């Protein structure tokens, strides 16, 4: 009944494995083809894993619900489903120990570091091959001193085991000259032809000779040491004190000559493989090793203490986590429940099986063969061989590939799939249960535009909607009398021939207030999931509101979308309130709206709010003469002056027509008197305006979509064409000053009128619309002439190939821009209403580059090598390209295709890294007592070598908007109180003030200085959301930050972002300074030597030829200043300057590339990920732990607080802030679930299993994994529970409260 709070992972003892399993498996017999029932005690046995049938036992006497629990008469099975076979577990009792492959093959060898054993060769060779380790006795000498844990080959080992033995057959019937106890040296002539090899004793038989490097001792009395015992010097051998042992070795007494022979082999440990390891782990005690490592770490210098602590941390982890390392290797191997590896028939009796079954079968066979072999007899080499096969079988079962590649039966060279294969990998257990790849009430279909719909609605095909809401439909039509019961209703709906109009009435009844989530497959950011109100439609496709065509990256070229149906009322409220598309109009990446008018609406609105002008061939002077009104009216009566003329002060249009109200003007427009693009005098609410009726209509549209008109008039600019930027500003202002509902209604009205006027306006693209200016012709001639000159400049030898190439590239890239400028000059001069020029001027479609390609020329074309061709493309798509030019451009086409197909992959990987490293950060908080801030600059320190200038408006907006003031500032007679959120108006005021020249840096709060333990506080975070208002407490800023970072990456340089997020060493590292001083440049030709000169020292830096520096001699230089030009290694920068400097550098450098692509991204997210990126410190002055270890900055802060003030003992735990790449920070986390789920499950799980890691369920990934409620969002404790009661019951309960005070 209790709730899950922590998940503990630790090693499993052999008795733990015995306790878990129900019985043991002996037969490698899965299932016979004939007997479809489980075969034997094999991997699918019934009574070892539970019944395979549904509810009946083997017999079925005591089974019924009166007496199910009473033990069965002919049976003993408690009533249960097959789910027991899903959970009940087996085990295998290996006759020989084996080691978990993870602890012996992981890069830090846990066995190899706990013991003084070499991982790469020693551990395996003792553990697989025939090598011997031995603790107790090594004092025997082989020309080598004593042994304690030394590894020796089994050849020399087996030698020293039983002395130094040699045997020589002797011919029978020949009495050799050597007697029984004769000492023999090398060269001594044992017979007419026999010679020994070494100093020893030769034993004679009738017919054999035995040369032993042993010592013989005659005696004539009783024996003290019998045959078999191994003796140490000074111990009595025989005859009492007359004969005593002289060396280590074994005693053999032969009474035939009444002699004691003592060999030189003492009883020494002999072990192979896992058992040996077990012995070691059995005799190892952790506390003494811990103390010894402590002394061996504290005294010596850093190099040895590095490995000392590397093993001491493991030892401490074992000691403090409970589980002792004796069961670090496994004796009994668990056996997975059968249903997790079922053998399922495919067709024709053949059974498809999981490879786990094959691995278990092989292991069972090897184990049984070992048991039989050890039972019958012991051929030593054969026993060792079969031990090796058993060991390799266990290792293969645990995982395949780390040692060879055990495979399926030959002919199918597919390596088998093992446990580690199931866990890890791009598609493992983690990367499918983290995902929930399958959902019940879902559908998908092609999408078509739904322009008739409002923004808070979407069209749903009636058939798939009927299918999706099937239980709701059944209940709702059961409310009426259409069907008696649920089965009849389901059968009625089970065929579409039984449909009725009453059914569709009920379906419309069900979904009156419901919402569904529409989803697009590549979900780059938060807006890829949006709720909608379904509207039943007759058709197949999904009708989609066009305005979300950019929220999703969803065009209508055939792409599909999915739909999901939330069930609980609580989830319905969630979706309808905070996911409905009407409530999400602004980006989370910045305040820029995403519900902005799209291409076609922009085109229509630009067409309706444009002013035309043609010509003035008459005396335009009109301000002066009042006769000019009549005279110029006559001129317009003739063809002297056009209606939309360029008069001096006024056009004849404003003179001729004047309108009392906008209604009158539009009514006169309806009579074809005047076009919407003609300026005319109109008397608005209080003023006379010279505007076109189109602009007046636009203003009226805005004023009608909203309620008040004064507000609408004050929030528009009716003096310019409505380009997409103007529309975006209009939408943002309306959202700011009106709210949600009115902004949505304004967007709907804008979309509708834009569609209508785009239709009636009639903009089409004809081949003649792509006008080719004639001026470019002569330009080409000029350029050609120049090229000829440059070419002859080469033929005189004045230039190199590189010089000529660069000159040609410069010439062509200049003339291209000249031509494009000429093209737009032509367009503005001659044909203002050209569809191409109109589309380019508005934000509808196209870019100046594309227009130049259409009408001008696509000059420079890139080579596959990355450079650009010498010969450009003269022709454009208005004309016809030559075959050769088309073949040339195919290079760039293919480059673009491949770059998409690969950079998308890279960017997705980057986004995954980000979202992992940031998933823990959610704003649950009180305002943290941060007396700290960041000073956002307003001036670029260096655009020229020495110059200061104000930063661009975009950068200042993206750095300051939505931030919280660190401290009060007054700049222009305005008191910006401390703690006031900076709106757009405040930022614009600050920019204007800096332009006047009053302040240069703004102190603001930031996540980079937030003191909240996990997450950031509301103040330190800021103000930007989908809304404008300050952030609600409890919403995941980390995930949205990561998504905002990653979303533009697909549409992008990027490797620079990679090497900045992942702290790396750039190849083009720039030389930097670390100490204050002066610059002494020496121009030595070998290598330019720059000296940072100080009072007591001088640092010398050598600069090669390519080292293009950027400082002048004698300049003062500080720490962290980049002396040369190039990228800066963040690590040495942190070593030199400090944390804040490197954080600022990272933020600015990351923002640089994003700006270079034109992407507008706020800096809150980069700051968040940077803060998570360097939340780690490595302690230098020890406290109660080792020194050269790095972990959480917050934890060390708490520990220092406890040590110094909370507890007695002023031990300063002096650390250094450590910067590591995003990957390492993501991996090394306190929680092991996320780390295991992220990159490498093997190493992470091994580390978390060495020491019991009680994973606390903080961070969203863990709660998703376990499936429990997310801490963020609605799960935040600040709003997790909120008692709700009506006013009348409130009065009842409060009346109970006042009477609770009795009398």
């Amino acid at each position: 009944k209790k709730e899950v709070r922590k998940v503990r992972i630790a090693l499993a003892s052999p008795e733990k494995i015995r306790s878990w399993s129900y019985g043991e498996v002996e037969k490698p017999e899965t299932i016979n083809y004939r007997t479809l029932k489980p075969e034997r005690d094999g991997l699918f046995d019934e009574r070892i894993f539970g019944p395979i049938k549904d509810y009946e036992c083997a017999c079925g006497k005591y089974k019924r619900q009166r007496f199910e629990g009473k033990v069965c008469e002919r049976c003993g099975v408690e009533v249960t489903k097959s789910i027991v076979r899903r959970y009940r577990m087996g085990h295998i009792e290996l006759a020989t120990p084996a080691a978990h492959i993870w602890f012996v093959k992981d890069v830090p060898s846990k066995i190899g570091t706990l013991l003084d054993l070499s991982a790469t060769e020693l551990e395996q060779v003792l553990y697989f091959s025939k090598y011997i380790v031995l603790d107790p006795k090594g004092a025997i000498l082989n020309g080598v001193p004593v042994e304690k844990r030394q590894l020796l080959t089994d050849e020399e080992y087996r030698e020293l085991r039983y002395g130094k033995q040699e045997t020589y057959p002797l011919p029978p019937g020949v009495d050799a000259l050597v007697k029984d106890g004769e000492e023999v040296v090398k060269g001594q002539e044992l017979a007419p032809g026999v010679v020994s090899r070494l100093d020893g004793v030769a034993l004679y038989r009738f017919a054999s000779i035995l040369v032993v490097k042993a010592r013989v001792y005659p005696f004539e009395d009783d024996v003290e040491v019998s045959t078999g015992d191994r003796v140490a010097p000074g111990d009595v051998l025989a005859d009492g004190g007359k004969v005593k042992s002289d060396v280590y070795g074994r005693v053999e007494v032969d009474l035939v000559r009444n002699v004691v022979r003592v060999v030189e082999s003492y009883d020494i440990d002999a072990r192979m493989g896992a058992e040996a390891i077990q012995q070691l782990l059995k005799e190892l005690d952790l506390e003494a090793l811990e103390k010894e490592l402590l002394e061996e770490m504290k005294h010596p210098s850093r190099a040895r203490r590095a490995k000392a602590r590397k093993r001491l941390e493991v030892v401490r982890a074992f000691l403090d986590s409970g589980n002792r390392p004796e069961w670090m290797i496994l004796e009994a191997v668990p056996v997975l429940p059968p249903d997790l590896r079922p053998m399922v028939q495919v067709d024709g009796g053949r059974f498809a099986t999981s490879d786990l079954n094959d691995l278990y079968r092989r292991l069972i066979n090897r184990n049984n063969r070992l048991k039989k072999l050890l039972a019958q007899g012991a051929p030593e080499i054969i026993i060792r061989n079969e031990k090796r096969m058993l060991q390799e079988a266990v290792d293969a079962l645990l995982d395949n590939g780390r040692r060879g590649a055990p495979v399926t039966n030959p002919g199918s060279d597919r390596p088998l799939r093992s446990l580690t294969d199931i866990l890890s990998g791009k598609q493992g257990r983690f990367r499918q249960n983290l995902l929930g790849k399958r959902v019940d009430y879902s559908g998908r279909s092609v999408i078509v535009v739904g322009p008739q719909l409002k923004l808070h609605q979407c069209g749903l095909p009636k058939r798939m909607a009927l299918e999706l809401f099937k239980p709701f439909l059944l209940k709702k039509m059961e409310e009426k009398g259409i069907a008696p019961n649920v089965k009849a209703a389901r059968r009625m709906l089970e065929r579409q021939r039984d449909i009725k109009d009453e059914v569709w009435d009920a379906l419309e009844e069900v979904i009156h207030g419901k919402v569904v989530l529409l989803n697009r497959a590549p979900t780059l950011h938060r807006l890829g999931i949006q709720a909608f109100q379904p509207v039943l439609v007759e058709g197949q496709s999904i009708q989609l509101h066009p305005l979300v065509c950019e929220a999703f990256n969803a065009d209508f070229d055939g792409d599909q979308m999915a739909v999901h149906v939330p069930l609980s009322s609580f989830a319905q409220a969630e979706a309808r309130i905070q996911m409905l598309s009407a409530h999400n109009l602004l980006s989370p990446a910045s305040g820029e709206p995403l519900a902005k008018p799209s291409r076609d609406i922009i085109l229509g609105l630009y067409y309706i709010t444009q002013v035309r002008k043609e010509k003035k061939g008459a005396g335009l002077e009109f301000a002066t003469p009042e006769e000019a009104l009549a005279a110029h009216e006559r001129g317009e009566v003739a063809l002297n002056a056009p209606i939309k003329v360029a008069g001096r002060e006024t056009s004849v249009g404003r003179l001729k027509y004047v309108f009392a109200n906008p209604d009158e003007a539009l009514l006169a427009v309806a009579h074809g008197i005047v076009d919407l693009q003609d300026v005319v005098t109109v008397r608005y609410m209080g003023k006379r305006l010279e505007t076109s009726p189109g602009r007046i209509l636009f203003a009226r549209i805005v004023a009608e979509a909203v309620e008040d008109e004064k507000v609408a008039w004050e929030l528009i600019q009716l003096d310019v064409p409505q380009e997409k930027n103007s529309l975006k500003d209009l939408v943002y202002q309306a959202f700011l000053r009106l709210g949600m509902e009115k902004t949505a209604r304004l967007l709907d009205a804008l979309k509708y009128y834009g569609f209508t006027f785009s239709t009636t306006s009639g903009i089409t693209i004809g081949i003649d619309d792509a006008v080719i200016p004639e001026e470019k012709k002569q330009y080409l001639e000029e350029a050609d002439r120049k090229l000829l000159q440059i070419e002859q400049a080469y033929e005189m030898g004045f230039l190199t190939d590189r010089e000529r190439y660069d000159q040609i590239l410069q010439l062509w890239t200049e003339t291209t821009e000249k031509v494009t400028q000429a093209v737009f000059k032509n367009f503005e001069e001659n044909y203002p209403f050209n569809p191409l020029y109109v589309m380019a001027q508005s934000g509808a479609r196209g870019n100046p580059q594309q227009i130049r390609q259409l009408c001008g020329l696509r000059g420079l074309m890139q080579k596959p090598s990355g450079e650009t061709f010498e010969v450009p493309v003269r022709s454009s798509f208005r004309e016809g390209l030559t075959v050769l030019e088309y073949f040339i451009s195919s290079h760039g086409a293919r480059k673009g295709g491949a770059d998409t197909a690969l950079r998308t992959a890279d960017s997705g990987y980057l986004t995954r890294k980000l979202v992992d490293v940031t998933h823990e950060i959610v704003v649950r908080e009180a305002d943290c007592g941060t007396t700290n801030y960041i000073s956002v600059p307003l001036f670029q320190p260096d655009e020229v070598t020495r110059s200061l200038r104000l930063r661009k408006r975009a950068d200042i907006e993206a750095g300051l908007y939505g931030r919280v003031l660190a401290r009060e500032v007054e700049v222009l007679g305005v008191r910006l109180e401390e703690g006031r959120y900076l709106s757009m108006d405040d930022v614009h005021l600050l920019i204007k003030a800096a332009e006047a020249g009053e302040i240069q840096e703004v102190p603001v709060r930031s996540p980079l200085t937030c003191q909240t333990r996990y997450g950031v506080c509301q103040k330190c975070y800021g103000y930007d959301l989908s809304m404008a208002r300050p952030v609600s407490i409890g919403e995941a800023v980390g995930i949205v930050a990561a998504q905002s970072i990653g979303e533009p990456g697909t549409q992008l340089g990027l490797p620079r972002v990679i090497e900045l997020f992942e702290a790396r060493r750039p190849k083009a590292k720039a030389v930097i300074s670390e100490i204050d001083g002066v610059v002494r440049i020496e121009e030595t030709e070998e290598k330019l030597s720059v000296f940072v000169e100080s009072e007591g020292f001088s640092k010398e830096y050598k600069l090669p030829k390519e080292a293009r520096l950027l400082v002048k001699d004698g300049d003062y230089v500080e720490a962290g200043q980049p002396l040369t030009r190039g990228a800066i290694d963040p690590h040495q920068l942190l070593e030199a300057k400090g944390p804040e400097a490197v954080e600022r550098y990272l933020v600015e450098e990351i923002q640089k590339v994003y700006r270079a692509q034109g992407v507008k991204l706020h800096d809150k997210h980069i700051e968040i990920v940077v803060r998570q990126m360097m939340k780690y410190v490595e302690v230098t002055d020890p406290g109660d732990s080792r020194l050269l270890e790095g972990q959480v900055l917050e934890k060390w802060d708490v520990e220092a607080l406890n040590e110094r003030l909370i507890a007695e003992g002023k031990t300063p735990v002096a650390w250094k802030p450590l910067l590591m790449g995003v990957t390492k920070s993501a991996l090394s986390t306190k929680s092991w679930l996320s780390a295991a789920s992220f990159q490498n499950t093997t190493h992470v799980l091994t580390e978390a299993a060495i020491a019991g890691k009680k994973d606390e369920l903080i961070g969203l990934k863990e709660n998703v994994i376990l499936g429990r409620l997310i801490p963020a969002g609605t799960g935040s404790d600040f709003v997790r529970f909120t008692q709700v009661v009506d006013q009348k019951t409130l009065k009842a309960i409060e009346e109970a409260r006042k009477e609770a005070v009795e009398a």
């Binding site: 995902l435 929930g436 399958r438 998908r444 239980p471 209940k475 998703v1264 409620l1269």
Partner: protein
Amino acid sequence: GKAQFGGQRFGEMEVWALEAYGAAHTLQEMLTLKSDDIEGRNAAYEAII
């Protein structure tokens, strides 16, 4: 597949977006009630009926 269409992948990017909002129970139902909790899904179907 052959018998029934099957569900739709909800992946992780969709999960990331769903938890990017304040949606908490939505993700819980869509990971357990509608996908995996056998007892949960049977009980939910019976209750909604």
